[PDB]
Design a protein around this ligand. Structure first.
Ligand SMILES: Nc1ncnc(Nc2ccccc2Cl)n1
Length: 123
């Protein structure tokens, strides 16, 4: 359209959302993955994950303050993906590819899943 495009604005917003998460400012949910807990903003979770979107869009579950993931989900793989959500940077390596891909499929993060497929292809 005719509007001025700020190419860095979305990245600046996300960096500031990550700063708010680092200070626990306005976080409203805890994700439990076995023995670990991770605080986050439900809006960011919904904007990144089909699983979280499907949970919180339902008015029955929108006010949930705790979500328990499947016990077969790897806490390290979840943390890598939560960091990705808030940075646009994905820590993919041969030592973690299968755990990250499993967690991305479970969380319904289609672009990360497509990227992990491309990673396996270029390995
Ligand atoms: N349409 C809409 N509006 C707000 N967030 C989302 N999230 C979403 C839904 C399903 C799949 C993946 C995501 Cl990131 N989608």
């Amino acid at each position: 359209d005719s509007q001025i495009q700020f190419t860095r604005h979305a990245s600046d917003v996300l960096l500031n959302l990550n700063r708010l998460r680092s200070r626990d400012i306005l976080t409203d949910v805890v994700i439990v993955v076995s023995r670990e807990q991770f605080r986050a903003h439900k809006t960011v979770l919904m904007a990144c994950s089909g699983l979280f979107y499907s949970i919180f869009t339902d008015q029955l579950k929108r006010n949930l303050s705790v979500i328990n993931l499947d016990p077969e989900i790897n806490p390290e793989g979840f943390n890598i993906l939560l960091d990705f959500m808030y940075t646009s940077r994905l820590n993919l390596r041969e030592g973690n590819i299968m755990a990250v891909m499993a967690t991305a499929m479970y969380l319904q993060m289609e672009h990360v899943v497509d990227t992990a497929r491309k990673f396996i292809k270029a390995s």
